[PDB]
Amino acid sequence: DDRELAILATAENLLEDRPLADISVDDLAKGAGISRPTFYFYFPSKEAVLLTLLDRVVNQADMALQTLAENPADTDRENMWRTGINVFFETFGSHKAVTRAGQAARATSVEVAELWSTFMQKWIAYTAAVIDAERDRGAAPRTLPAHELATALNLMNERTLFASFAGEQPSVPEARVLDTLVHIWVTSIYGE
Amino acid sequence: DDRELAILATAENLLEDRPLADISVDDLAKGAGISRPTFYFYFPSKEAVLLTLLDRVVNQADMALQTLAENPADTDRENMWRTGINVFFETFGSHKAVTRAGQAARATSVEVAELWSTFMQKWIAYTAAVIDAERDRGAAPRTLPAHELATALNLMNERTLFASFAGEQPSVPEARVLDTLVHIWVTSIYGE
Numbered sequence: 001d002d003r004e005l006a007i008l009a010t011a012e013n014l015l016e017d018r019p020l021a022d023i024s025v026d027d028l029a030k031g032a033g034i035s036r037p038t039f040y041f042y043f044p045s046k047e048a049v050l051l052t053l054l055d056r057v058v059n060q061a062d063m064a065l066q067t068l069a070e071n072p073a074d075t076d077r078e079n080m081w082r083t084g085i086n087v088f089f090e091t092f093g094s095h096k097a098v099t100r101a102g103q104a105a106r107a108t109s110v111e112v113a114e115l116w117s118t119f120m121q122k123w124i125a126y127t128a129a130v131i132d133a134e135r136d137r138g139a140a141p142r143t144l145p146a147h148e149l150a151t152a153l154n155l156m157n158e159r160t161l162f163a164s165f166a167g168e169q170p171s172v173p174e175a176r177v178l179d180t181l182v183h184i185w186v187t188s189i190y191g192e
Numbered sequence: 193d194d195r196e197l198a199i200l201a202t203a204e205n206l207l208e209d210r211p212l213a214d215i216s217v218d219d220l221a222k223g224a225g226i227s228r229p230t231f232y233f234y235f236p237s238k239e240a241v242l243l244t245l246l247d248r249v250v251n252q253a254d255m256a257l258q259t260l261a262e263n264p265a266d267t268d269r270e271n272m273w274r275t276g277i278n279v280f281f282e283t284f285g286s287h288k289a290v291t292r293a294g295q296a297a298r299a300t301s302v303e304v305a306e307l308w309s310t311f312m313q314k315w316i317a318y319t320a321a322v323i324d325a326e327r328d329r330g331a332a333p334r335t336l337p338a339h340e341l342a343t344a345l346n347l348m349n350e351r352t353l354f355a356s357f358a359g360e361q362p363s364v365p366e367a368r369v370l371d372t373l374v375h376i377w378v379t380s381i382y383g384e
């Protein structure tokens with residue numbers, strides 16, 4: 001479990017410099033101070049290591065969001081949405097290599113794809129429930145179906161956060177991405 | 193060139209049923225009514241076939257958008273933005289397998305990635321120029337930097353159009369995706 005954490009730290013450190021395809025099991029064993037068969041005792045494959053790393057990062061974001069949901073900020077609605085979006089900006093932005101590699105793995109691994117899909121459904125359902133609350137309270141007008149609006153806003157964040165972290169061309173500079181998303185969320189949720 | 197079109201039609205037809213990884217050069221040659229070495233005369237690889245198919249689809253969208261830019265619809269601004277977004281909805285939605293496969297290839301092929309990147313820069317620059325025109329005319333307020341807003345809106349369309357076409361979970365139903373995007377564009381461009 002000390003050895004399990006070493007393998008995970010090693011893989012995260014190596015993913016900073018090259019993609020999964022260019023990391024071997026022997027690379028992971030060696031960085032973690034173990035042999036190849038001992039590695040295989042903890043994980044069936046390098047792909048299982050990535051899946052665990054992504055799982056931990058996705059769970060970290062999810063728990064931070066649950067914490068925030070229970071403990072709303074005392075501020076205006078634009079700043080509340082910013083604090084929510086910020087959960088993902090900071091959590092995934094603190095783990096850029098796992099983010100990029102976990103995202104590429106969605107194409108090749110059904111476990112990575114299903115993990116992503118489960119959490120995006122949860123985050124979208126929570127986004128729609130808050131939009132519905134805002135509407136029920138008369139702060140937001142009833143425009144699009146809340147679930148469809150929430151779906152597009154979450155997919156926008158996914159693609160736009162992750163492009164910014166990878167410094168893709170094109171992308172929103174990382175120091176501008178938070179304000180850019182919060183503007184689009186607030187205008188599309190509250191705007192007639 | 194008759195044989196080149198056959199290879200392209202064959203690959204598009206086969207991509208409807210399986211990914212590129214599961215299509216062989218011999219599969220492409222056989223569907224197009226040629227041998228393997230004759231195939232290799234027209235394309236250096238199955239990846240070069242995908243790149244050409246994506247190139248044709250991206251150019252088709254780009255030209256349709258240029259046509260629209262010169263020949264604006266005579267209608268209210270919400271419907272004008274809808275006609276623009278619709279270029280991509282119809283062009284890429286008419287070529288779903290190429291869209292999905294071209295998008296997966298971005299991870300593995302620098303030519304596919306560079307092609308995508310060039311056109312997204314062009315479409316974003318045109319989006320920002322129209323937003324700037326709307327602002328200059330006093331129809332839209334000066335909120336976010338236009339280029340940053342345009343970048344996020346284009347990345348939203350990319351991810352949300354393509355998720356809907358692939359029937360990803362989660363996604364906006366394809367029959368609702370156009371209205372959903374147009375709402376977010378109009379509110380975020382015109383909303384204070």
Ligand SMILES: O=C(NCCC(F)(F)F)c1ccc(C#CCNS(=O)(=O)c2ccccc2)cc1
Pocket residue numbers: 068069072077080081082083084085088092123124126127130153154155157158159161
């Ligand atoms: O970015 C998101 N989803 C995509 C995640 C990604 F990027 F990692 F893919 C995201 C998902 C959900 C939220 C949210 C929220 C709402 N909670 S809230 O901000 O605390 C809030 C706002 C307004 C009133 C009450 C509470 C914000 C952002």
Ligand SMILES: O=C(NCCC(F)(F)F)c1ccc(C#CCNS(=O)(=O)c2ccccc2)cc1
Pocket residue numbers: 260261264269272273274275276277280284315316318319322345346347349350351353
């Ligand atoms: O969807 C887009 N880009 C992403 C493409 C994708 F999805 F394939 F990745 C997209 C890019 C640009 C536009 C546009 C536009 C503006 N032209 S316009 O709609 O004709 C117009 C509107 C308002 C006033 C004047 C003209 C619309 C959509």
